[PDB]
């Protein structure tokens, strides 16, 4: 009936009162972290609820099964996922903060590229800014501009060398 289902929860509560606080200190000595010991205790008692063979015989010690399960839980937690990550904390001192270099070289190169782009015909300038700035394919630019495929190919081929001519005349390093 309805009381048979409440008897099971009343059974779990007793093993709580008698074993959970004692298993917590064991897991705490094995790990050293209390917030992790609480997780260990909860998972162990969950597996206890899932195994009626351990809750069946009262004439057989049940605390030892809990200790062994907690030990095999902590030894598992002590493997690969903990192995790599657990080492460092950024908030903790002794860890270098991530730095990013300045954009000086990139800014100067961008200025020179824009200058060399100004001295190109509208067609060449509108072609190189659709292949490198927009990253489109060779046929996409041809479809957009309403021109042929080899037309885009030749326009890129010449505009690249025109930029090279304008840069070498200003002493841009190879």
């Amino acid at each position: 009936v309805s009381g048979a289902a409440a008897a099971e929860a009343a059974l779990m509560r007793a093993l709580y009162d008698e074993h959970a606080a004692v298993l917590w200190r064991y897991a705490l000595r094995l790990t050293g972290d209390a917030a992790q010991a609480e997780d260990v205790v909860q998972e162990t008692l969950l597996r206890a609820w899932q195994h009626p063979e351990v809750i069946g015989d009262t004439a057989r010690p049940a605390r030892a099964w809990l200790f062994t399960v907690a030990r095999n839980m902590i030894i598992d937690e002590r493997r690969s996922a903990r192995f790599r990550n657990v080492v460092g904390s950024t908030d903790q001192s002794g860890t270098p903060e991530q730095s990013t270099p300045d954009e000086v070289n990139a800014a100067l190169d961008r200025l020179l590229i824009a200058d060399a782009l100004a001295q190109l015909s509208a067609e060449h300038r509108a072609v190189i800014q659709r292949s490198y700035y927009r990253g489109w394919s060779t046929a996409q630019i041809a479809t957009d501009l309403g021109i042929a495929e080899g037309t885009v190919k030749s326009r890129l081929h010449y505009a690249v060398r025109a930029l090279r001519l304008t840069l070498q005349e200003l002493g841009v390093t190879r």
């Binding site: 929860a9 209390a34 609820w49 080492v87 460092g88 950024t90 908030d91």
Partner: protein, 195 residues
């Protein structure tokens, strides 16, 4: 509950306080506090004034106090809690990541417990730990003993990024490091003019 369960409803944890906030008349309690204020009983009148200070704020703003109970917790973008790689091959992540991870672990375990129909003792003892995990994520160390990391070091919470000299304000807003700046040892210069 076994006897007169048909007559009352009770609850535990934070969901109970959520229901209590839902079953709460804002205007009625505000005017009930003003009633106590209208009668000069200083000893028991100051303690009512201070309550009105809180209740009228939820009354006028049109904003429900239900926000004090959370159903979903926001996660700060990863670049503000970055995980860097070390020259020894291993890694190092911010404490906020460990706090979020503990929250996630306990929440997923609670989902499992709800699905399995686990005993109410386990489910309540799990919800308690979820509460403590959210409390550690927001302000670790405020209640009880803080969540210790490796080496008995208290983990830095989200509120720790704003506190004191090391917090965001006095460290990155009041004072900033600037470019076009240098530093060197000073030396007397009698030859130089005042300007």
């Amino acid at each position: 509950v076994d006897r007169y369960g048909e007559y009352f409803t009770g609850a535990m944890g934070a969901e109970s306080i959520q229901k209590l906030i839902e079953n709460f008349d804002i205007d009625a309690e505000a005017e009930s506090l003003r009633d106590v204020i209208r009668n000069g009983k200083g000893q028991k009148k100051l303690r009512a004034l201070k309550r009105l200070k809180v209740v009228a704020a939820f009354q006028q703003s049109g904003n429900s106090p239900m926000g004090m109970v959370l159903d979903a917790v926001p996660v700060i973008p990863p670049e503000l809690r970055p995980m860097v790689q070390l020259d020894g091959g291993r890694f190092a992540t911010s404490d906020l990541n460990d706090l979020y991870r503990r929250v996630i672990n306990r929440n997923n375990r609670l989902k499992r417990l709800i699905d399995l129909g686990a005993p109410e003792i386990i489910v309540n003892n799990e919800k308690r730990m979820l509460q403590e995990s959210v409390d550690a994520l927001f302000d670790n160390g405020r209640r009880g003993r803080p969540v210790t990391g490796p080496g008995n070091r208290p983990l830095k919470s989200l509120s720790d990024l704003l506190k004191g000299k090391q917090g965001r304000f006095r460290q990155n807003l009041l004072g900033k490091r600037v470019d076009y700046s240098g530093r060197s040892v000073i030396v007397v210069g009698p030859q130089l003019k005042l300007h």
